[PDB]
Amino acid sequence: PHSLFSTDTDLTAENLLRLPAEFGCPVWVYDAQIIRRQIAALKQFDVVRFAQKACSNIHILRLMREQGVKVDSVSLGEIERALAAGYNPQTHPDDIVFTADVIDQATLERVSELQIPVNAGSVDMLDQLGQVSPGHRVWLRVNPGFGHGHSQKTNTGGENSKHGIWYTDLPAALDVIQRHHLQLVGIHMHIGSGVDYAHLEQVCGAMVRQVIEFGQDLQAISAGGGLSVPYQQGEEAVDTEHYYGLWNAAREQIARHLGHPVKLEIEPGRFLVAQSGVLITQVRSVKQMGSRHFVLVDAGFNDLMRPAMYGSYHHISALAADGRSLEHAPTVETVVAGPLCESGDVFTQQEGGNVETRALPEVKAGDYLVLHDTGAYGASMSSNYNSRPLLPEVLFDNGQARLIRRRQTIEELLALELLHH
Amino acid sequence: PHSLFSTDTDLTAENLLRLPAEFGCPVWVYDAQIIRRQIAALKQFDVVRFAQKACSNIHILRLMREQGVKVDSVSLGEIERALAAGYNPQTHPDDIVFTADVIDQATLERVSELQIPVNAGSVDMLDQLGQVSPGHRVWLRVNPGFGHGHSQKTNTGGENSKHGIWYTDLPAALDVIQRHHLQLVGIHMHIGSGVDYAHLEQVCGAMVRQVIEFGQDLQAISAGGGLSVPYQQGEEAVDTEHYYGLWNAAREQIARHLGHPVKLEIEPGRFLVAQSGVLITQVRSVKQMGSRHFVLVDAGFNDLMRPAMYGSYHHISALAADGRSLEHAPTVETVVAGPLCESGDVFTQQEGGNVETRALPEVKAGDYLVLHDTGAYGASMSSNYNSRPLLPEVLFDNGQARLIRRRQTIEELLALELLHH
Ligand SMILES: *Cc1c(COP(=O)(O)O)cnc(C)c1O
Ligand SMILES: *Cc1c(COP(=O)(O)O)cnc(C)c1O
Ligand SMILES: [Li+]
Ligand SMILES: [Li+]
Ligand SMILES: [Li+]
Ligand SMILES: [Li+]
């Protein structure tokens, strides 16, 4: 991640310390220019379609749209978010694509009404759509028979994945397409390769194979998402030119087979927004538990789910309350944990739950911690566990911080239950 | 769990099938009498203090209060919930206890204002409270040096737990108590033993030891929570008389040492509400993925977190759309998964993420699935991941189903971001 004393971005030490006083704490902060930088790295692609489930604030969606980035919505709620951000299906039919493995009644009505292209990930879903919206423009999400990672575990592909039409179910999908006169716009895969370029090549190769074998005309293909970001010091960052080389080559083979140009979409979620965001949280309690040195803050896993749920790594920095530099202060092996009355609420833990320590300056109550690289799957995954309200979100742009989401209140949550007082 | 064809409770087959049509789907359903039954099993205890983080709907809190059950709140939001349910600190000072390892400014002001007893789980927190509210009535949550489960992992006790004042920090806690003239009401432990009665005996024994060694007068002790429920067919249920025997014996030794009666609280969360609740979700897509038979429903891990996050088991039943019995229908090994565009959204998975199958009738789109025993840590843990709104909650009481929480809307979530339109 970025050092707080780099000062190329707006995510610096003086900048971060003042934010909690102005906007409240804990608080999510994003740097608009870092997002613009990630968008520019994918300029070779015809279409960059942001996977909004990674970070859905409508002001961040508006920023995407301003940069010519389109959007993928995976729920009816995400469709409404896109519309609130100025995406318009009537003037621009491909600006929003609705993508999922299932579709419910309200969504069917909404995508029929607005003629939002649907990327169906089950033949059943394709049939349900077709019956109520004959001739709808569709994409097919294909499961090519393999995913990424352990073959036994939940996956984005392969037989232990709920995602997409199994490749040998394609003929059955074509029957559904023909029955309802569906218009095939494109074929999509979302598997994710990180910086495993050999794995990426297998995805590209399966796309070429499957599209050519399916034998239908289409206007576009999508590489899906899954570009990784280096959460830990020294890890390798994605080479977008390399991604483009491999996916362009697959697109070109398909286009050659079809006899006309085929548009190439890429659908990043994490890559665009992860590094742009931080989470600022105050230290509230510091104590020794046996041989462990614990530092408890006011943000918990209901806020940032990753570490507690998956053992994910987020870099952690410390900010002294009075602003003195802790740059070169001595470090102590620290266990960082939250305020929830819940055993799993520990930020420094490995996959599977083992507690671990992080080398941090010796902070006191009143000091702040910064969790780095929380722009993706941070606020987007938040819950209200322990009756804790969604946090405020702040957007930095050229040194200026502005509120883009206010703190939810307990009253707003209670209004759901107070049905006539 | 209960069979849907038992029909001793209101959670039967005909009853469940009609609920989604009336109230929407997916939907949480609770049976009031099952909660009353769990409350009655702990009648020996002086105080049953419901851990509301397990299930916080204010109508369910009102039901608790009607049964003479008190409440533990672990956040400012939970305090407000308790007040909305008719608990009153002014007339009854011990009806709400605020319990946590940290305390923030807004909470300090609220508990000072209302004189809500605070159960402090860090000396720092005890000091912060004392400074602004001298003479406050307090409890001390003690970490006795050990928890429950693997010694390396996040825990409710032991050195790999963020919870409670480490037992050798007790003398330092007493200095804080004396400095601010705090009034010690009681001493508490929340470790959790399930049906491991030998482990329970170690907790009881540590309580006696620690209280006597601390050498302070107090009015009460608390056994904390952690009573288990049998989620799987054949598992052993808690013997409350056994729990009482062991904790009463510890209370009696303490009382004998103090020279006066000592009140005994028990603080169950799961035990009171788990078995009372179900989650009803419609089947939307059925497909074969390689060798796996997948059934995707309209509820996902944002709704019920347990299986996806921890590999937790919830019994699953099937309901045919037209109401024909599936009681004795042949079963097929099924992978049950949700609607999220997220690989981990699979209900039939083991701890660590391995996909597994469940023997279920061969349902089609339009049929419903019932996830059993979701009363605890179901709605309470829900998130808005994938911009999905909090579900509706329905309460059954003597055959009558009533709405106790309406479905959240996307507009309510968007209002947080629309700051002047
Ligand atoms: C989540 C998701 C993405 C983005 O995945 P990342 O790893 O964040 O890039 C892209 N497409 C679909 C259909 C998704 O569900
Ligand atoms: C969660 C919690 C409980 C209840 O735990 P269960 O396992 O649901 O019984 C009791 N006390 C405190 C302080 C808690 O955090
Ligand atoms: Li897998
Ligand atoms: Li929240
Ligand atoms: Li442990
Ligand atoms: Li939700």
GROMACS .gro file of N, CA, C and O in nm, chain B residues 109-191:
model
  332
  530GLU      N    1  -2.179   0.914   2.733
  530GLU     CA    2  -2.280   1.014   2.764
  530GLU      C    3  -2.416   0.953   2.790
  530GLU      O    4  -2.485   0.990   2.885
  531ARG      N    5  -2.454   0.852   2.712
  531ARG     CA    6  -2.583   0.787   2.729
  531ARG      C    7  -2.590   0.706   2.857
  531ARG      O    8  -2.689   0.718   2.933
  532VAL      N    9  -2.489   0.626   2.889
  532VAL     CA   10  -2.494   0.548   3.013
  532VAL      C   11  -2.478   0.635   3.136
  532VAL      O   12  -2.540   0.606   3.240
  533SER      N   13  -2.405   0.747   3.126
  533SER     CA   14  -2.398   0.840   3.239
  533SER      C   15  -2.535   0.904   3.263
  533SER      O   16  -2.585   0.907   3.374
  534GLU      N   17  -2.594   0.955   3.156
  534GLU     CA   18  -2.723   1.021   3.161
  534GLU      C   19  -2.830   0.934   3.223
  534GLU      O   20  -2.908   0.980   3.307
  535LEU      N   21  -2.840   0.808   3.180
  535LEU     CA   22  -2.946   0.720   3.224
  535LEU      C   23  -2.907   0.636   3.344
  535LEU      O   24  -2.988   0.557   3.394
  536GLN      N   25  -2.782   0.643   3.385
  536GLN     CA   26  -2.731   0.560   3.495
  536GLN      C   27  -2.755   0.412   3.466
  536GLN      O   28  -2.809   0.337   3.547
  537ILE      N   29  -2.716   0.371   3.346
  537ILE     CA   30  -2.718   0.230   3.307
  537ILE      C   31  -2.587   0.165   3.353
  537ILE      O   32  -2.478   0.214   3.320
  538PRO      N   33  -2.598   0.063   3.437
  538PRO     CA   34  -2.482  -0.011   3.484
  538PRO      C   35  -2.396  -0.058   3.368
  538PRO      O   36  -2.445  -0.099   3.263
  539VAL      N   37  -2.264  -0.043   3.383
  539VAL     CA   38  -2.170  -0.080   3.278
  539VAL      C   39  -2.085  -0.200   3.323
  539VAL      O   40  -2.025  -0.198   3.429
  540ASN      N   41  -2.084  -0.302   3.240
  540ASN     CA   42  -1.997  -0.417   3.255
  540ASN      C   43  -1.873  -0.394   3.168
  540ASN      O   44  -1.882  -0.397   3.045
  541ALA      N   45  -1.766  -0.347   3.231
  541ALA     CA   46  -1.644  -0.311   3.159
  541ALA      C   47  -1.554  -0.432   3.136
  541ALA      O   48  -1.531  -0.511   3.226
  542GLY      N   49  -1.503  -0.445   3.013
  542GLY     CA   50  -1.417  -0.555   2.976
  542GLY      C   51  -1.274  -0.511   2.947
  542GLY      O   52  -1.195  -0.589   2.894
  543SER      N   53  -1.237  -0.390   2.982
  543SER     CA   54  -1.099  -0.341   2.976
  543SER      C   55  -1.080  -0.240   3.090
  543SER      O   56  -1.177  -0.169   3.121
  544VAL      N   57  -0.962  -0.235   3.150
  544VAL     CA   58  -0.937  -0.138   3.258
  544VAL      C   59  -0.946   0.005   3.202
  544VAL      O   60  -0.998   0.095   3.269
  545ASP      N   61  -0.897   0.026   3.082
  545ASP     CA   62  -0.903   0.153   3.013
  545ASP      C   63  -1.047   0.207   3.006
  545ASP      O   64  -1.074   0.324   3.031
  546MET      N   65  -1.137   0.120   2.966
  546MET     CA   66  -1.280   0.150   2.956
  546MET      C   67  -1.337   0.185   3.093
  546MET      O   68  -1.410   0.282   3.111
  547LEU      N   69  -1.294   0.108   3.194
  547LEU     CA   70  -1.336   0.134   3.331
  547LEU      C   71  -1.289   0.273   3.376
  547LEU      O   72  -1.362   0.346   3.444
  548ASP      N   73  -1.167   0.310   3.337
  548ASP     CA   74  -1.114   0.441   3.371
  548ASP      C   75  -1.188   0.554   3.300
  548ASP      O   76  -1.221   0.657   3.362
  549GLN      N   77  -1.214   0.537   3.171
  549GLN     CA   78  -1.284   0.636   3.091
  549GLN      C   79  -1.424   0.661   3.146
  549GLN      O   80  -1.470   0.775   3.157
  550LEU      N   81  -1.493   0.553   3.184
  550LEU     CA   82  -1.625   0.564   3.244
  550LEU      C   83  -1.618   0.640   3.376
  550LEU      O   84  -1.695   0.732   3.401
  551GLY      N   85  -1.526   0.598   3.462
  551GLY     CA   86  -1.512   0.655   3.595
  551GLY      C   87  -1.483   0.805   3.592
  551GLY      O   88  -1.539   0.881   3.672
  552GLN      N   89  -1.396   0.847   3.501
  552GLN     CA   90  -1.359   0.987   3.492
  552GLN      C   91  -1.479   1.077   3.465
  552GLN      O   92  -1.491   1.183   3.527
  553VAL      N   93  -1.569   1.035   3.376
  553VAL     CA   94  -1.685   1.118   3.343
  553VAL      C   95  -1.808   1.085   3.425
  553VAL      O   96  -1.905   1.162   3.425
  554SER      N   97  -1.808   0.971   3.494
  554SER     CA   98  -1.925   0.932   3.574
  554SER      C   99  -1.878   0.868   3.705
  554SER      O  100  -1.888   0.746   3.725
  555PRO      N  101  -1.821   0.950   3.793
  555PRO     CA  102  -1.773   0.903   3.922
  555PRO      C  103  -1.883   0.837   4.002
  555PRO      O  104  -1.999   0.880   3.997
  556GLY      N  105  -1.854   0.725   4.066
  556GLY     CA  106  -1.949   0.649   4.143
  556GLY      C  107  -2.043   0.563   4.061
  556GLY      O  108  -2.144   0.514   4.113
  557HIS      N  109  -2.015   0.546   3.932
  557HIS     CA  110  -2.104   0.465   3.846
  557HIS      C  111  -2.113   0.322   3.897
  557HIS      O  112  -2.015   0.271   3.952
  558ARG      N  113  -2.229   0.260   3.880
  558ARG     CA  114  -2.243   0.117   3.918
  558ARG      C  115  -2.185   0.030   3.808
  558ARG      O  116  -2.222   0.044   3.691
  559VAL      N  117  -2.086  -0.054   3.840
  559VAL     CA  118  -2.018  -0.133   3.739
  559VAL      C  119  -2.016  -0.283   3.764
  559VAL      O  120  -2.019  -0.332   3.875
  560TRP      N  121  -2.003  -0.358   3.653
  560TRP     CA  122  -1.967  -0.498   3.657
  560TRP      C  123  -1.824  -0.511   3.596
  560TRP      O  124  -1.784  -0.424   3.519
  561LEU      N  125  -1.755  -0.618   3.631
  561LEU     CA  126  -1.624  -0.645   3.570
  561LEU      C  127  -1.636  -0.778   3.493
  561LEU      O  128  -1.687  -0.875   3.550
  562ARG      N  129  -1.610  -0.773   3.363
  562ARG     CA  130  -1.600  -0.898   3.287
  562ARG      C  131  -1.455  -0.949   3.299
  562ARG      O  132  -1.362  -0.878   3.261
  563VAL      N  133  -1.439  -1.068   3.356
  563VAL     CA  134  -1.307  -1.124   3.377
  563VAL      C  135  -1.271  -1.229   3.273
  563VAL      O  136  -1.350  -1.319   3.244
  564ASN      N  137  -1.150  -1.219   3.219
  564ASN     CA  138  -1.095  -1.327   3.137
  564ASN      C  139  -1.009  -1.414   3.230
  564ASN      O  140  -0.911  -1.365   3.288
  565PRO      N  141  -1.055  -1.535   3.257
  565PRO     CA  142  -0.994  -1.621   3.357
  565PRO      C  143  -0.870  -1.693   3.310
  565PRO      O  144  -0.819  -1.782   3.382
  566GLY      N  145  -0.818  -1.661   3.192
  566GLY     CA  146  -0.696  -1.721   3.143
  566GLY      C  147  -0.719  -1.831   3.041
  566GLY      O  148  -0.622  -1.878   2.980
  567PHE      N  149  -0.844  -1.864   3.012
  567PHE     CA  150  -0.874  -1.968   2.914
  567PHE      C  151  -1.012  -1.947   2.853
  567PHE      O  152  -1.095  -1.874   2.909
  568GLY      N  153  -1.031  -1.994   2.730
  568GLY     CA  154  -1.160  -1.980   2.663
  568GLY      C  155  -1.222  -2.117   2.637
  568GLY      O  156  -1.213  -2.208   2.719
  569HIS      N  157  -1.279  -2.132   2.518
  569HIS     CA  158  -1.338  -2.258   2.475
  569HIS      C  159  -1.302  -2.284   2.328
  569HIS      O  160  -1.329  -2.198   2.244
  570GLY      N  161  -1.245  -2.399   2.300
  570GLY     CA  162  -1.208  -2.433   2.161
  570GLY      C  163  -1.057  -2.428   2.143
  570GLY      O  164  -0.981  -2.427   2.241
  571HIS      N  165  -1.012  -2.420   2.018
  571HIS     CA  166  -0.871  -2.417   1.985
  571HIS      C  167  -0.800  -2.299   2.049
  571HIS      O  168  -0.842  -2.185   2.032
  572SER      N  169  -0.686  -2.324   2.112
  572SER     CA  170  -0.609  -2.225   2.182
  572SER      C  171  -0.541  -2.123   2.093
  572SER      O  172  -0.518  -2.009   2.142
  573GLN      N  173  -0.526  -2.147   1.965
  573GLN     CA  174  -0.464  -2.050   1.875
  573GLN      C  175  -0.563  -1.949   1.818
  573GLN      O  176  -0.522  -1.843   1.769
  574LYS      N  177  -0.691  -1.985   1.812
  574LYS     CA  178  -0.789  -1.909   1.737
  574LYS      C  179  -0.862  -1.803   1.815
  574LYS      O  180  -0.860  -1.800   1.938
  575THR      N  181  -0.933  -1.714   1.742
  575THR     CA  182  -1.012  -1.611   1.813
  575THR      C  183  -1.102  -1.680   1.914
  575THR      O  184  -1.155  -1.787   1.885
  576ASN      N  185  -1.116  -1.622   2.033
  576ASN     CA  186  -1.180  -1.695   2.143
  576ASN      C  187  -1.257  -1.602   2.234
  576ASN      O  188  -1.240  -1.480   2.229
  577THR      N  189  -1.340  -1.659   2.322
  577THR     CA  190  -1.415  -1.578   2.418
  577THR      C  191  -1.333  -1.559   2.546
  577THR      O  192  -1.368  -1.477   2.631
  578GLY      N  193  -1.224  -1.634   2.557
  578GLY     CA  194  -1.136  -1.623   2.674
  578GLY      C  195  -0.994  -1.663   2.637
  578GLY      O  196  -0.972  -1.723   2.531
  579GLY      N  197  -0.903  -1.656   2.735
  579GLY     CA  198  -0.764  -1.696   2.708
  579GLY      C  199  -0.690  -1.581   2.641
  579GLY      O  200  -0.750  -1.478   2.606
  580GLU      N  201  -0.560  -1.598   2.621
  580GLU     CA  202  -0.476  -1.493   2.565
  580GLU      C  203  -0.504  -1.459   2.421
  580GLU      O  204  -0.467  -1.348   2.377
  581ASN      N  205  -0.574  -1.543   2.346
  581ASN     CA  206  -0.612  -1.509   2.209
  581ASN      C  207  -0.755  -1.459   2.199
  581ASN      O  208  -0.826  -1.482   2.100
  582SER      N  209  -0.798  -1.389   2.301
  582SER     CA  210  -0.929  -1.328   2.308
  582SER      C  211  -0.913  -1.179   2.342
  582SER      O  212  -0.837  -1.146   2.435
  583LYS      N  213  -0.992  -1.095   2.280
  583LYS     CA  214  -0.991  -0.952   2.310
  583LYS      C  215  -1.079  -0.921   2.430
  583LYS      O  216  -1.083  -0.809   2.480
  584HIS      N  217  -1.151  -1.021   2.480
  584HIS     CA  218  -1.256  -1.004   2.576
  584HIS      C  219  -1.215  -1.004   2.721
  584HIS      O  220  -1.156  -1.101   2.772
  585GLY      N  221  -1.261  -0.904   2.796
  585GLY     CA  222  -1.254  -0.899   2.938
  585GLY      C  223  -1.119  -0.863   2.998
  585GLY      O  224  -1.021  -0.841   2.928
  586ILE      N  225  -1.124  -0.827   3.126
  586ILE     CA  226  -1.002  -0.789   3.198
  586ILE      C  227  -0.924  -0.916   3.232
  586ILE      O  228  -0.977  -1.006   3.298
  587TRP      N  229  -0.801  -0.924   3.183
  587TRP     CA  230  -0.716  -1.041   3.215
  587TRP      C  231  -0.711  -1.056   3.366
  587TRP      O  232  -0.683  -0.956   3.436
  588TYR      N  233  -0.726  -1.176   3.418
  588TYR     CA  234  -0.737  -1.198   3.561
  588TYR      C  235  -0.625  -1.141   3.643
  588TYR      O  236  -0.651  -1.083   3.752
  589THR      N  237  -0.502  -1.133   3.592
  589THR     CA  238  -0.392  -1.074   3.667
  589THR      C  239  -0.390  -0.922   3.657
  589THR      O  240  -0.309  -0.857   3.724
  590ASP      N  241  -0.483  -0.864   3.582
  590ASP     CA  242  -0.501  -0.720   3.576
  590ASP      C  243  -0.606  -0.671   3.676
  590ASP      O  244  -0.629  -0.550   3.687
  591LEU      N  245  -0.663  -0.762   3.755
  591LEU     CA  246  -0.763  -0.729   3.853
  591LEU      C  247  -0.723  -0.629   3.957
  591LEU      O  248  -0.797  -0.531   3.983
  592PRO      N  249  -0.603  -0.637   4.014
  592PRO     CA  250  -0.553  -0.537   4.108
  592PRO      C  251  -0.550  -0.399   4.045
  592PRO      O  252  -0.593  -0.302   4.108
  593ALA      N  253  -0.511  -0.390   3.918
  593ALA     CA  254  -0.513  -0.262   3.847
  593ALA      C  255  -0.655  -0.212   3.826
  593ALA      O  256  -0.681  -0.092   3.835
  594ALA      N  257  -0.749  -0.303   3.805
  594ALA     CA  258  -0.891  -0.265   3.794
  594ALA      C  259  -0.942  -0.210   3.926
  594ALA      O  260  -1.016  -0.112   3.928
  595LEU      N  261  -0.900  -0.270   4.038
  595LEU     CA  262  -0.942  -0.223   4.169
  595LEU      C  263  -0.894  -0.081   4.195
  595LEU      O  264  -0.969   0.004   4.243
  596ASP      N  265  -0.770  -0.050   4.156
  596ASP     CA  266  -0.718   0.086   4.170
  596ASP      C  267  -0.809   0.185   4.096
  596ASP      O  268  -0.833   0.296   4.144
  597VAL      N  269  -0.852   0.149   3.975
  597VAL     CA  270  -0.942   0.235   3.898
  597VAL      C  271  -1.076   0.249   3.968
  597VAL      O  272  -1.126   0.361   3.986
  598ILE      N  273  -1.132   0.139   4.015
  598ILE     CA  274  -1.256   0.142   4.092
  598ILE      C  275  -1.243   0.237   4.210
  598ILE      O  276  -1.331   0.323   4.231
  599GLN      N  277  -1.136   0.228   4.287
  599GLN     CA  278  -1.115   0.312   4.403
  599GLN      C  279  -1.092   0.457   4.368
  599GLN      O  280  -1.145   0.548   4.436
  600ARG      N  281  -1.017   0.484   4.262
  600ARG     CA  282  -0.990   0.619   4.218
  600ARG      C  283  -1.118   0.696   4.187
  600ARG      O  284  -1.128   0.814   4.218
  601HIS      N  285  -1.213   0.633   4.118
  601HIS     CA  286  -1.336   0.701   4.078
  601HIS      C  287  -1.455   0.665   4.165
  601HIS      O  288  -1.570   0.692   4.126
  602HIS      N  289  -1.433   0.599   4.277
  602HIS     CA  290  -1.540   0.559   4.367
  602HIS      C  291  -1.647   0.475   4.299
  602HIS      O  292  -1.766   0.488   4.330
  603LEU      N  293  -1.608   0.390   4.204
  603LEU     CA  294  -1.703   0.306   4.133
  603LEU      C  295  -1.769   0.208   4.230
  603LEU      O  296  -1.712   0.176   4.335
  604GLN      N  297  -1.896   0.177   4.204
  604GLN     CA  298  -1.969   0.084   4.291
  604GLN      C  299  -1.978  -0.052   4.223
  604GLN      O  300  -2.039  -0.065   4.117
  605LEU      N  301  -1.906  -0.151   4.278
  605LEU     CA  302  -1.902  -0.283   4.215
  605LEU      C  303  -2.031  -0.360   4.243
  605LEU      O  304  -2.067  -0.386   4.357
  606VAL      N  305  -2.108  -0.383   4.137
  606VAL     CA  306  -2.235  -0.452   4.144
  606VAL      C  307  -2.214  -0.603   4.135
  606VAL      O  308  -2.282  -0.682   4.200
  607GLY      N  309  -2.127  -0.643   4.040
  607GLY     CA  310  -2.106  -0.784   4.016
  607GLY      C  311  -1.985  -0.816   3.933
  607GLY      O  312  -1.918  -0.732   3.874
  608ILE      N  313  -1.958  -0.948   3.924
  608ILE     CA  314  -1.846  -0.996   3.844
  608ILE      C  315  -1.899  -1.098   3.743
  608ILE      O  316  -1.987  -1.176   3.776
  609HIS      N  317  -1.851  -1.088   3.620
  609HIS     CA  318  -1.913  -1.163   3.509
  609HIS      C  319  -1.807  -1.235   3.428
  609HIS      O  320  -1.692  -1.189   3.421
  610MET      N  321  -1.840  -1.349   3.372
  610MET     CA  322  -1.761  -1.418   3.273
  610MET      C  323  -1.851  -1.462   3.156
  610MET      O  324  -1.967  -1.499   3.177
  611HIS      N  325  -1.804  -1.441   3.034
  611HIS     CA  326  -1.872  -1.495   2.916
  611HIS      C  327  -1.771  -1.573   2.833
  611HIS      O  328  -1.680  -1.518   2.771
  612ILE      N  329  -1.778  -1.705   2.849
  612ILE     CA  330  -1.682  -1.797   2.790
  612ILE      C  331  -1.755  -1.898   2.700
  612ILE      O  332  -1.731  -1.902   2.580
   0.00000   0.00000   0.00000
